[PDB]
Design a protein around this ligand. Structure first.
Ligand code: FSC
Ligand code: FSC
Ligand code: CL
Lengths: 234, 11, 236, 11
């Protein structure tokens, strides 16, 4: 039980960091838990994804604030903003590379139920997408293509093996439509995917079990909100 | 943050 | 020259970190600006204090969450095991390191015989506050040493404030408020905490008609916090 | 948090 005991300790500490809103610690604890070898349970997957989401979420918000100031820079037009924006950016990139590295070394596999395979491939698209948000050079196309390929393989599994109301399928379609809109600059694909997803989920809404109703309906709300915004603009 | 459309992470 | 340029760059990055809510970065930028050797303006002092207040306030909150869990868990409910104590100590150690950095900076660069009363009281209150935060987490012979250091720092700031500042000055009010929290929470001296809070509010109440508009909001907020603490401490 | 009395602060 060398890993069995240590792994369970790491899971226990990830849950403590969660309660304390210590998401950097939570992420590191869940990364250590993954590397012990075992596959994650549903609950453990969620701890991993929430931990790193909150970590990169702070960096992305900071990067957006700074990048915006950088674009309006005029009473002191010095290198201060670019320098600090590059620091945050390098930090964000390092977190995305850590998550992508963990997905590719331990989590993405050809086995497992459809939920787990879609969950990790969506994560792969998401962190490639975060890289794409800040990419500017000749690597931007590669990063976008990597995000798209991950999202596409996940989409293919979800429509083949999971019901239209499944929260993971729904959250994948939401984030892929955001990719279409913001990253690939294809508002028609974004609108069409969000609308088809929302329409097909509505059709099974009446059958949705309790254990999934909350998550599904929250994502359906986001899908509809994005649609209203994207369509009214066009 | 300034982004109006949302991804799952906001939840 | 170079010193002034570098300092202005660090202050600017501190303000960018503030807007980004990157308070760790903000604290370190302001630390670097302090280490350029020039005294801090009123605005700059507030930037330094808010950056570190946010950093340590995040740790203090986390430390309280873990301490609460640590007690319920040990009630035989079983979060049994050392994980909760180990992690609580990791957070505790990080918080002690930040307080140590702040205290070191106050001693090496900011606390001085020179300067107006506001500045001198401002930094000696900070020293008292960060010893108080170390006392929140300390035990045993260490806690006594830290508590002595906080009281000494607060008392020195008090003597200056009661001698050189109006009873309505926000820094003076802020000092008294935090010292009274020290009395109540750390020293276990509710009478002293109530005496100080009561006297502070009352002596400020008198000179309110003279209060200015620049610090009107600052002083009001602090006087209200004094009143609420008194409301709670009197009924308890 | 568990503390009702406050130190200087804006929240
Ligand atoms: C950190 C983990 C905790 C807080 C314990 O759980 C996060 C959440 O974990 C689950 O919810 C998931 C979950 C999300 C739900 C929409 C949250 O639901 C509620 C009611 O708050 C958002 C989260 O980020 C998370 C983990 C992520 C995703 C997303 C992952 O892509 C890689 C795909 C869609 C969604 C799925 C996996 C949801 O099932 C649960 O269904 C939620 O409800 C309960 C009561 O457990 C819980 O709040
Ligand atoms: C420089 C910018 C920032 C950091 C945002 O300023 C913080 C604040 O800076 C000033 O206020 C101070 C200040 C505080 C005010 C009382 C907050 O007022 C309101 C109405 O929100 C609380 C802050 O923590 C701060 C910096 C701290 C202290 C405390 C420091 O101990 C070492 C002593 C009392 C108090 C003094 C220094 C206040 O003057 C100002 O008077 C406040 O109001 C305005 C309108 O500027 C501003 O919110
Ligand atoms: Cl920088």
């Amino acid at each position: 039980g060398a890993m069995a005991m240590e792994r369970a300790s790491l899971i226990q500490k990830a849950k403590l960091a969660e309660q304390a809103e210590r998401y950097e610690d939570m992420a590191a604890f869940m990364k250590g838990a993954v590397e012990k070898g075992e596959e994650l349970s549903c609950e453990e997957r969620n701890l991993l994804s929430v931990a790193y989401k909150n970590v990169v979420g702070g960096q992305r918000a900071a990067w957006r604030v700074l990048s915006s100031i950088e674009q309006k820079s005029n009473e002191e037009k010095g290198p201060e903003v670019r320098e600090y924006r590059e620091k945050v950016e390098t930090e964000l990139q390092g977190v995305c590379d850590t998550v992508l590295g963990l997905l590719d070394s331990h989590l993405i596999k050809e086995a497992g139920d459809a939920e787990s395979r879609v969950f990790y491939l969506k994560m792969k698209g998401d962190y490639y997408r975060y890289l794409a948000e800040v990419a500017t050079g000749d690597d931007k196309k590669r990063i976008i293509d990597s995000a798209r390929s991950a999202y596409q393989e996940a989409m293919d599994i979800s429509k083949k093996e999971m019901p239209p109301t499944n929260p993971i399928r729904l959250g994948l379609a939401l984030n892929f439509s955001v990719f279409h809109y913001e990253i690939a600059n294809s508002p028609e694909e974004a609108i069409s995917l969000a609308k088809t997803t929302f329409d097909e989920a509505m059709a099974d809404l009446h059958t949705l079990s309790e254990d999934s109703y909350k998550d599904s309906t929250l994502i359906m709300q986001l899908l509809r909100d994005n649609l209203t915004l994207w369509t009214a603009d066009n | 943050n300034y982004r109006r459309y949302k991804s799952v992470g906001i939840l």
